[PDB]
Amino acid sequence: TSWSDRLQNAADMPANMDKHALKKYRREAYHRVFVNRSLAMEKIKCFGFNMDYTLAVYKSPEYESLGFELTVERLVSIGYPQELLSFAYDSTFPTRGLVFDTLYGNLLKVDAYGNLLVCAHGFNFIRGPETREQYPNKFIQRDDTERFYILNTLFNLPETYLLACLVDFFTNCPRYTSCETGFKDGDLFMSYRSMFQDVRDAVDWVHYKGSLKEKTVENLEKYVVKDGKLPLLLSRMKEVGKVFLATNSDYKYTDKIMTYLFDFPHGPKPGSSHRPWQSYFDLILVDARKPLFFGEGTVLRQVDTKTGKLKIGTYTGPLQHGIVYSGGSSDTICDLLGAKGKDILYIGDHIFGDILKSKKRQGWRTFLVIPELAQELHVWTDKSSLFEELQSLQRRIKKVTHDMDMCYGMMGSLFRSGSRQTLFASQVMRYADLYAASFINLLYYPFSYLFRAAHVLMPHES
Amino acid sequence: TSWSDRLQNAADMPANMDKHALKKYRREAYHRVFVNRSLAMEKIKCFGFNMDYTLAVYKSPEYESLGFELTVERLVSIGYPQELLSFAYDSTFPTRGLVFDTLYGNLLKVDAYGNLLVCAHGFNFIRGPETREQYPNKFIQRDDTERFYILNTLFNLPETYLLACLVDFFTNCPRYTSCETGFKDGDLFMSYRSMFQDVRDAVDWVHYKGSLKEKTVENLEKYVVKDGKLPLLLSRMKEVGKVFLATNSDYKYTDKIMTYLFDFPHGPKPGSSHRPWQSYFDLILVDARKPLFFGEGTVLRQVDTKTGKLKIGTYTGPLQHGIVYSGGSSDTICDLLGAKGKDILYIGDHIFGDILKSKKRQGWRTFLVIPELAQELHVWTDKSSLFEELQSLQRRIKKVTHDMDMCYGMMGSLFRSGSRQTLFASQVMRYADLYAASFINLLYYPFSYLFRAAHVLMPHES
Ligand SMILES: Nc1ncnc2c1ncn2[C@@H]1O[C@H](COP(=O)(O)OP(=O)(O)OP(=O)(O)O)[C@@H](O)[C@H]1O
Ligand SMILES: Nc1ncnc2c1ncn2[C@@H]1O[C@H](COP(=O)(O)OP(=O)(O)OP(=O)(O)O)[C@@H](O)[C@H]1O
Ligand SMILES: [Mg+2]
Ligand SMILES: [Mg+2]
Ligand SMILES: [Mg+2]
């Protein structure tokens, strides 16, 4: 039972819009919207979306396995050894939000302050005392972006595992000599940094020059969560305000995916005429290039929706019905919809590119979708006893921490290691006004709902 | 009764080191150390200090008034109008941590997200609806550092007031025409941005080319808080670990100030031989250039302590008794004292230059001194009723907020406006592991004390 099984199980259910059914449903953690800062829904005038991993939630582990397989095949084709073909994606290894240290070839799970929570070299988990050789203060400088790479998105799960597989392979293959910063193969030296770059380039290639999109689109039922409640929620949003799409994906792919997401023999509710996905949006913008989108952005272009090509030149015209934009900036959206930042709720899955940047650059209201929550909540309740014991409680503390963590997978919870919160957890709390397993959870609240969080007090004020 | 009257009143008292007296004393908020993250004092091996506004706390409003007077005199001498000479420093206006908007000439008090809490143009406080003309989302982008300047330190209090005085003066003087971004004087245009730069340059000049230091040093009793307990606390620190000084000030000034701070007819305790201030430190470093100090720093120099001049060339030798360093980097301290970041408690008053940067760049433990707390605590307790009423509770909400805020001064509490926390408050909570009205409050805790803060939970974990 992956997080995507959980999401698809809830997706299969019809919406009971009886006001009491709705209130009962949203009491369950799975169907709840969680609140970091208070947000009055009645003040929201524009609901903004992205597509990948928000509207189109890719099924796990099938989609990660496909990305992994195609990335391996690309590395082998550029000259990596044939033994790579014997790797197989393992969903129990990677947790999202890990930091790859390109100098020493380690995956790290860190807190908000750069403190080490977990360090793995290949599949070797390095204990407290041994990490001090490479990390004398058990600490990384995360402003050192050339050295440290943060694996923020669900698209990064295959490479998280592949990095560990590669380091394990080269370490244990007698053709190679292990050094501090990479591997010697006779008169060839491959640094962890250059290996990392090859992996990053191959993952980018699979998505943009390779066959990943084609293989996804040819079996959408295998690869993409589908939910009859999506059209219903969007239609309700459009009754109270404007709705926009801002996606980093291109028009042709967006069209294929979005057509699938709305392919039911009815419109918003059973019995109603089907309508095209585009009719659900007041503004459609592709090739957004977020987070640059929230600064200067790029030149505003118009998509020719017949050919899927961009028209030549900068688009200087007004918002018209049926127009589709490419590039531009967040200011494009604000200007065209007559919105200020605080009128906008932007629904995203990218903690940095969607949420942190829209909040800090533009003062947008934010809703973070965390698909793994759909299964992390089950574990959190089902093992509440272990956490409770940890709260009560030194070598027992380390042991309980390990056993708690192992319930989530080899790299632990997305949100913590024992009693220490991760960097990802802290950025969620800081930048996401609201968060949930799925944006569909908004269906279960009335549109004048006041999401409330308690006021914060300093220690001297308490 | 300024915060410095409060500090000097407590400074006048002898230390009763009876263990029960100590425990009783530290129950009072004024003498307490407040805790944001847990910190085990027994793990601290090095205690680091800065001088200005930490060891040497300048008396208020006398020192601000002196800075103000000399800064005005410098502006007039470079050609500003004679009417500046009729300004007089008013301590009830400025609160620390305000943002000057160089485009529109406003002082802003903002939260952690760039939301506007207070906006003043000169002495005109702009209400919610009117701020929307210039701030359409009631929001500033604080990554726009060329436009927005954050007035972080107690050294910035005189210029905070002077900026408001200048904007008030030019607005109301019929020789000048007010425009959106500055003032027209016939064929001369003075932008708020260029006026701001003149002020900043004059404040820098007063400290580094002017007479501020000379006038301070000639009346240290008027200008500097002095406390017999300082030598006692430092001697106790040196019994359990190493003690260092890292100051942005030069050696000659540091020597004058530090000699004064230790000028008692006894050493650590009454009855003991007096010792020179330098003997309290394992390492003394001046001209630190923080925060650059916590990155690449500058070349390590040696002070000639007879002449007060730097010796020619880079210092390549070891830590010797009686050596005084200039420049270098935080790594200099770590290397010379054999310390890792987490072995170090750095005691600072500069939220950015001392605390945020040592935490994020090096994983140092942090203690923030907030001299205004010495009087903000009195107000917090003495007006607890107003805050309590606000918590209970719309136009009554705005009214109560105003009356609460006015108790602190025209720009409100350092820490909040009504129920909204300031940017300064959030940076304190995030980057300062410990904080207090004075570092002397550490005297009242045993050196194996465990400062404790509750573990943090996400909304879905609660
Ligand atoms: N999740 C992330 N993914 C990619 N880059 C990030 C992420 N979070 C922050 N950054 C960027 O990485 C760079 C270095 O990070 P750094 O620790 O100096 O800043 P920060 O995010 O402000 O830290 P803090 O969480 O204490 O506020 C910055 O430019 C920051 O914007
Ligand atoms: N108190 C401060 N004084 C001066 N500069 C600051 C201060 N706080 C942050 N900065 C710097 O100002 C620049 C822009 O601030 P910005 O809001 O983008 O980052 P930030 O501090 O990481 O925000 P956050 O508080 O959300 O983590 C950054 O380089 C940041 O380090
Ligand atoms: Mg997405
Ligand atoms: Mg200082
Ligand atoms: Mg930050």
Curated annotation (Swiss-Prot), chains A, B:
Gene Ontology terms: biological process: adenosine metabolic process; allantoin metabolic process; amide catabolic process; dGMP catabolic process; dGMP metabolic process; GMP catabolic process to guanine; GMP metabolic process; IMP catabolic process
Pfam families: 5_nucleotid
Keyword rRNA-binding: no
Catalytic activity: a ribonucleoside 5'-phosphate + H2O = a ribonucleoside + phosphate; a 2'-deoxyribonucleoside + a ribonucleoside 5'-phosphate = a ribonucleoside + a 2'-deoxyribonucleoside 5'-phosphate; IMP + H2O = inosine + phosphate; GMP + H2O = guanosine + phosphate
Keyword terms: Allosteric enzyme, ATP-binding, Cytoplasm, Disease variant, Hereditary spastic paraplegia, Hydrolase, Magnesium, Metal-binding, Neurodegeneration, Nucleotide metabolism, Nucleotide-binding, Phosphoprotein, Transferase
GO terms under cellular component: cytoplasm; cytosol
Binding of IMP, residues: 50, 52, 200, 204, 213, 247-249, 290
InterPro entries: HAD-like_sf, HAD-SF_hydro_IG_5-nucl, HAD_sf, Pur_nucleotidase
Residue positions binding adenosine 2: 410
Cofactor(s) in the UniProt record: Mg(2+)
Record localization: Cytoplasm, Cytosol
Binding site for Mg(2+): 50, 52, 349
Binding site for dATP: 142, 152, 427, 430
Chain residues that bind P(1),P(4)-bis(5'-adenosyl) tetraphosphate: 152, 360, 427, 431
Subunit text: Homotetramer.
Function (record text): Broad specificity cytosolic 5'-nucleotidase that catalyzes the dephosphorylation of 6-hydroxypurine nucleoside 5'-monophosphates. In addition, possesses a phosphotransferase activity by which it can transfer a phosphate from a donor nucleoside monophosphate to an acceptor nucleoside, preferably inosine, deoxyinosine and guanosine. Has the highest activities for IMP and GMP followed by dIMP, dGMP and XMP. Could also catalyze the transfer of phosphates from pyrimidine monophosphates but with lower efficiency.
Protein name per Swiss-Prot or TrEMBL: Cytosolic purine 5'-nucleotidase
The organism of origin for this protein: Homo sapiens (Human)
Higher taxonomy: Eukaryota, Metazoa, Chordata, Craniata, Vertebrata
Gene behind this protein: NT5C2
